[PDB]
Write an enzyme that holds these catalytic residues in place. Structure first.
Site, PDB file in Angstrom:
ATOM      1  N   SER A 102       0.834  -1.191   0.000  1.00  0.00           N
ATOM      2  CA  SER A 102       0.000   0.000   0.000  1.00  0.00           C
ATOM      3  C   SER A 102       0.872   1.246   0.000  1.00  0.00           C
ATOM      4  O   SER A 102       1.836   1.353   0.762  1.00  0.00           O
ATOM      5  CB  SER A 102      -0.938   0.023   1.214  1.00  0.00           C
ATOM      6  OG  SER A 102      -0.203  -0.024   2.425  1.00  0.00           O
ATOM      7  N   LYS A 108       6.010  12.033  -0.305  1.00  0.00           N
ATOM      8  CA  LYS A 108       6.211  11.882   1.132  1.00  0.00           C
ATOM      9  C   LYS A 108       7.123  10.707   1.454  1.00  0.00           C
ATOM     10  O   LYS A 108       7.979  10.815   2.340  1.00  0.00           O
ATOM     11  CB  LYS A 108       4.865  11.712   1.838  1.00  0.00           C
ATOM     12  CG  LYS A 108       3.920  12.897   1.691  1.00  0.00           C
ATOM     13  CD  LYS A 108       4.548  14.188   2.197  1.00  0.00           C
ATOM     14  CE  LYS A 108       3.520  15.303   2.315  1.00  0.00           C
ATOM     15  NZ  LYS A 108       2.817  15.564   1.029  1.00  0.00           N
ATOM     16  N   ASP A 138      -3.095   4.797  -3.067  1.00  0.00           N
ATOM     17  CA  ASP A 138      -4.318   5.546  -2.800  1.00  0.00           C
ATOM     18  C   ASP A 138      -4.357   6.832  -3.619  1.00  0.00           C
ATOM     19  O   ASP A 138      -5.389   7.180  -4.204  1.00  0.00           O
ATOM     20  CB  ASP A 138      -4.428   5.850  -1.305  1.00  0.00           C
ATOM     21  CG  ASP A 138      -4.643   4.602  -0.472  1.00  0.00           C
ATOM     22  OD1 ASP A 138      -5.360   3.694  -0.938  1.00  0.00           O
ATOM     23  OD2 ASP A 138      -4.091   4.526   0.646  1.00  0.00           O
ATOM     24  N   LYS A 279      -8.425   5.319   4.940  1.00  0.00           N
ATOM     25  CA  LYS A 279      -7.019   5.471   4.582  1.00  0.00           C
ATOM     26  C   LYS A 279      -6.404   4.143   4.155  1.00  0.00           C
ATOM     27  O   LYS A 279      -5.960   3.992   3.012  1.00  0.00           O
ATOM     28  CB  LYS A 279      -6.244   6.068   5.761  1.00  0.00           C
ATOM     29  CG  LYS A 279      -6.967   7.206   6.478  1.00  0.00           C
ATOM     30  CD  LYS A 279      -7.479   8.274   5.518  1.00  0.00           C
ATOM     31  CE  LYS A 279      -6.348   8.956   4.765  1.00  0.00           C
ATOM     32  NZ  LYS A 279      -5.412   9.654   5.687  1.00  0.00           N
ATOM     33  N   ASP A 304       3.670  -3.499   4.311  1.00  0.00           N
ATOM     34  CA  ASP A 304       3.803  -2.068   4.090  1.00  0.00           C
ATOM     35  C   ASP A 304       4.962  -1.791   3.140  1.00  0.00           C
ATOM     36  O   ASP A 304       5.827  -2.638   2.909  1.00  0.00           O
ATOM     37  CB  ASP A 304       4.022  -1.330   5.414  1.00  0.00           C
ATOM     38  CG  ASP A 304       2.746  -1.177   6.215  1.00  0.00           C
ATOM     39  OD1 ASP A 304       1.692  -1.666   5.758  1.00  0.00           O
ATOM     40  OD2 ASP A 304       2.796  -0.567   7.304  1.00  0.00           O
ATOM     41  N   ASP A 462      -5.869  -2.178  12.646  1.00  0.00           N
ATOM     42  CA  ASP A 462      -5.282  -3.512  12.712  1.00  0.00           C
ATOM     43  C   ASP A 462      -5.711  -4.240  13.980  1.00  0.00           C
ATOM     44  O   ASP A 462      -6.049  -5.429  13.937  1.00  0.00           O
ATOM     45  CB  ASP A 462      -3.759  -3.419  12.629  1.00  0.00           C
ATOM     46  CG  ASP A 462      -3.169  -2.537  13.710  1.00  0.00           C
ATOM     47  OD1 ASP A 462      -3.069  -2.999  14.865  1.00  0.00           O
ATOM     48  OD2 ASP A 462      -2.805  -1.382  13.404  1.00  0.00           O
TER      49      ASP A 462
END
Ligand SMILES: OC[C@H]1O[C@@H](O[C@H]2[C@H](O)[C@@H](O)[C@H](O[C@H]3[C@H](O)[C@@H](O)[C@H](O[C@H]4[C@H](O)[C@@H](O)[C@H](O[C@H]5[C@H](O)[C@@H](O)[C@H](O)O[C@@H]5CO)O[C@@H]4CO)O[C@@H]3CO)O[C@@H]2CO)[C@H](O)[C@@H](O)[C@@H]1O
Ligand code: UPG
Ligand code: MG
Lengths: 718, 67, 90
Positions: A102, A108, A138, A279, A304, A462
């Protein structure tokens, strides 16, 4: 033959650990009884606060120690898995795995780390016909899409080099940038020749990504345009039609030798104005729906961007527990500890957080299993859908329609016993369906987020997602391979670490006041171990322990200033109780250290990190959560509470000497009790409040100021 | 030695100096075989817990025997 | 220019030595056999006839330029059961 063996503590380090904690309860109970008897300490208000505050800590310890009861250790072997399933006869019978990556914004977080992670995913030591990779962004950005295209091009060279030479880690950025002698156990004759070319190739590839990243710094006034000569579908970060594409698949780019590589799917959700998009839970749910239609797999692995695979056998190690006929019958997911690299030998900010993973997770693994952290979990696809463990009595098209969605293919997809394309339709229809099953308003009448898949609501979804899955009778497993098997990046500056701690606290507070609260949620139907609901209660009520913590940190200054009397002087009976209390904490830590394997320093740092975390982040988190709950921060602002206690304690404790010294200076020792108790609080939050900021590194020669001014005001009093 | 102090403190604590002599002798012994013997256990220094472990041992013993 | 080639060659040699070490981890049931096609004289750690060989001597391998190199002599003592053999002095 069993594929994996689960053995508890060897019984030599277990009974003493159980016997110390069970003894500590009686000592605490006797200690509490003695205090409650005393009604006066020259101030009834302080007596009311101290006893109530201390009682809260005892419950917190009770909610925190019992979950560590009956720790369990597990061992896994991969040779038997290969021997049983791979089979020289062929074909392999190993289960498929889907990887989720993701991303949100390319600026960033650099895309090179994401690209390195993607490369690591595709290099797993697993049959290429089984493993698949999914990347979700996203915020539709051309840099991410182009980065994947460049990553796919370099994967042709990277994959075969990794597989032939069996190098680890298989992430080029984290593999080449290693000072470990790369000629350690390699036996191939042409390892050096290929390695030199590969390092040259990776450096060339790294330049292209940097050029691609630096190219997209400026946005063309008209908008991004694809190389084919068409506008990029998503020109607005808040508005872009859902996009799905396949790279490095079975029918497409092949390896240099001529072999195939794991298929990479790039999927971007559909966003339109006037709708609320979650998100991470929304992206994960979209990935699950897309994965089911495209390549239905019995297991789902979530990762991640920062985290990357460090052990090539992680999939096999994860699968040896999930695919075991006996113990794998009821397993929702297999949790892997998150181990952070690029961290100094002296982890000041306790970023590695080994205490939780090496103590709590191992201890909590004994009842049902660990708790979902967010990464490195091989979720069973059926578990995510929310069906319930097999071999149990209880957990139409309209029900499936109202429970999953409107797409018939996805509705029919879940009926597959194992997974795959049901009627091998043309790729266009599946792609069209996959594009259709990621609609912006697709999850309108569905139960997605409410009771299926990742759960919407709190920031730390989570914890919430794992709680509901375990509430239906599922079990989770804890894996600790000799290699980490999963490594990522940890915060370097405190501003991110404190924000990370605050965000965790805020999410837990939101869970407490939401319908999904362990206090009054999940009782119906049972299926949740009574000893594990305590762990969930602990995991949800831990932030509230901060408010007494600040009160407990405030009592020494308030008492030492005016009252100077918290408890009556010992009556020859509290000495043993106090002695038993202090020794009890020491002995339990040693035994916990003895069997857990953690180091004492980390325990002190974690204990020294919990105090600072409670005073600063949790106090604001609880108040902000309470304010937000009633309604329905900066790095400077987050440090305000802890500084107040540091100033109040240091000025209060030192002022105690001056006022007490000016006094008869003969009835001291209560000063030592309050001073030492004041030292307890200050020593807990001194090293961080000073160390976390400091000037450069201790040795400031400024500590003399306190001595002088306090010797000078003393001189003003002397 | 730590016991000595305790008893030495409970005693008249006036005819000391022989107490200092014995403390210095035990310190000569302890400083010689503390560094290698203990530093082998731990990374750099378990002072994070050793000092508090030793300090409370003094007050705790100083109190229990004092009773 | 020579140093880079020498480092490459040394890395290749280290790879070869590591392969040779790893290959010898598992001993064949029958015993070790030499490349020529004969068994290694010492198949038992406690029993092996004395062996002597000369490598890189005056009459043998020569340097790339054409010069000679110091002679190397590999000697393994003779051990038999029922006798005491000292570790280093012998
Ligand atoms: O939750 C979502 C998020 O979790 C991340 O993992 C978190 C985890 O969720 C947290 O629970 C964990 O915080 C624990 C601390 O590690 C633990 O040390 C501490 O427990 C304290 C306890 O509060 C305290 O009362 C007691 O200490 C004694 C003191 O030493 C004495 O002075 C005092 O008098 O008495 C008390 C008790 O008698 O026990 C310990 C030691 O202080 O607080 C938590 C305990 O549950 O942090 C984890 C950090 O990772 C996860 O990583 C994320 O991915 C996820 O989103
Ligand atoms: O809308 C979004 C924004 C970010 N991400 C990504 O998903 C993860 C969400 O993490 P985030 O909430 O942005 O904060 P982090 O500090 O980056 O990650 C924290 O939260 C993770 C679990 O959610 C943990 O694994 C990490 O240890 C913890 O540092 C990251 O990979 C993000 O890049 C999304 O999927 N959707
Ligand atoms: Mg982060």
């Amino acid at each position: 033959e069993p594929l994996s063996i689960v053995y508890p503590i060897p019984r030599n380090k277990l009974t003493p650990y159980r016997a110390v904690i069970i003894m500590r309860l009686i000592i605490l109970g006797l200690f509490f009884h003695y205090r409650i008897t005393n009604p006066v300490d020259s101030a009834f208000g302080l007596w009311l606060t101290s006893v109530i505050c201390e009682i809260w800590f005892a419950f917190s310890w009770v909610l925190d120690q019992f979950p560590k009861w009956k720790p369990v250790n597990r061992e896994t072997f991969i040779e038997r898995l290969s021997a049983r399933y791979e089979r020289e006869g062929e074909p392999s019978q190993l289960a498929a795995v889907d990887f989720f990556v993701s991303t949100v914004d390319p600026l960033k977080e650099p895309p090179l780390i994401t690209a390195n992670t993607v490369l690591s995913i595709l290099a797993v030591d697993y049959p290429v016909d089984k493993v698949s990779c999914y990347v979700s962004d996203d915020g539709a950005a051309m840099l991410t899409f182009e980065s994947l295209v460049e990553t796919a091009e370099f994967a042709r060279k990277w994959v075969p080099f990794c597989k032939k030479f069996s190098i680890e880690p298989r992430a080029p950025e984290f593999y080449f940038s290693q000072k470990i002698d790369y000629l350690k156990d390699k036996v191939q004759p042409s390892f050096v020749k290929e390695r030199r070319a590969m390092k040259r190739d990776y450096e060339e590839y790294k330049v292209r990504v940097n050029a691609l990243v630096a190219k997209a710094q400026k946005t063309p006034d008209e908008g991004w345009t694809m190389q084919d000569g068409t506008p990029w579908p998503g020109n607005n970060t808040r508005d872009h039609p859902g996009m799905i594409q396949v790279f490095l698949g079975n029918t497409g780019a092949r390896d240099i030798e001529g072999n195939e590589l794991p298929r990479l799917v790039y999927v971007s959700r559909e966003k339109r104005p006037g709708y609320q998009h979650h998100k991470k839970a929304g992206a994960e749910n979209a990935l699950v729906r897309v994965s089911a239609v495209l390549t239905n797999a019995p297991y789902i692995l979530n990762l991640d961007c920062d985290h990357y695979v460090n052990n090539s056998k992680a999939v096999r190690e994860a699968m040896c527990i999930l695919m075991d006929p006996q113990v794998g019958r009821d397993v929702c997911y297999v949790q892997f500890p998150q181990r952070f690299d690029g961290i100094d030998r002296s982890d000041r900010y306790a970023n590695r957080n080994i205490v939780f993973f090496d103590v709590n997770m191992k201890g909590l693994d004994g009842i049902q299993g660990p708790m979902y952290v967010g990464t490195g979990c091989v979720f069973n696809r059926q578990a995510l859908y929310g069906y319930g463990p097999p071999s149990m009595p209880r957990l139409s098209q309209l029900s499936f329609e109202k429970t999953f969605g409107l797409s018939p293919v996805f509705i029919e997809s879940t009926l597959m016993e194992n997974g795959g394309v049901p009627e091998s339709a043309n790729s266009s229809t599946l792609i069209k369906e996959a594009i259709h099953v990621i609609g912006c308003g697709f999850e309108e009448k569905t139960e997605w987020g409410k009771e299926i898949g990742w759960i919407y609501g709190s920031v730390t979804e989570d914890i919430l997602s794992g709680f509901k899955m375990h509430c239906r009778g599922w079990r989770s497993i804890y894996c600790m391979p000799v290699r980490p098997a999963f490594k990522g990046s940890a915060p370097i500056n405190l501003s991110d670490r404190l924000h990370q701690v605050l965000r965790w606290a805020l999410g837990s507070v939101e869970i407490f006041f939401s319908r999904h609260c362990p206090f009054w949620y999940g009782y119906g139907g049972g299926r949740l171990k009574w000893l594990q609901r305590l762990a969930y209660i602990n995991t949800i009520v831990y932030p509230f322990t901060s408010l007494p913590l600040i009160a407990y940190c405030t009592i020494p200054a308030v008492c030492l200033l005016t009252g100077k009397f918290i408890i009556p002087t010992l009556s020859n009976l509290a000495s043993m109780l106090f002695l038993g209390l202090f020794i009890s904490i020491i002995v339990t830590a040693v035994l916990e250290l003895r069997w857990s394997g953690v180091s004492i320093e980390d325990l002190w740092r974690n204990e020294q990190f919990w105090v600072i975390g409670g005073v600063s982040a949790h106090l604001f988190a609880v108040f902000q959560g309470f304010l937000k709950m009633l309604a329905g921060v900066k790095w400077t602002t987050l440090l305000i509470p802890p500084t107040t206690l540091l100033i109040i304690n240091i000025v209060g404790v030192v002022a105690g000497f001056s006022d007490a010294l000016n006094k008869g200076y003969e009835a001291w020792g209560p000063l030592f009790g309050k001073v030492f108790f004041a030292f307890w609080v200050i020593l807990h939050l001194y090293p961080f409040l000073k160390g976390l900021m400091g000037r450069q590194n201790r040795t400031p020669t400024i500590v003399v100021l306190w001595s002088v001014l306090l010797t000078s005001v003393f001189s003003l009093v002397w | 030695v730590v016991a000595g102090f305790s008893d030495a403190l409970n005693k008249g604590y006036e005819a000391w100096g022989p107490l200092f002599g014995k403390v210095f002798f035990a310190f000569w012994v302890i400083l010689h075989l503390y560094p290698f013997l203990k530093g082998l256990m731990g990374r750099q220094n378990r002072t994070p817990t050793i000092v508090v472990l030793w300090s409370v041992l003094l007050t705790s013993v100083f109190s229990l025997v004092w009773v």
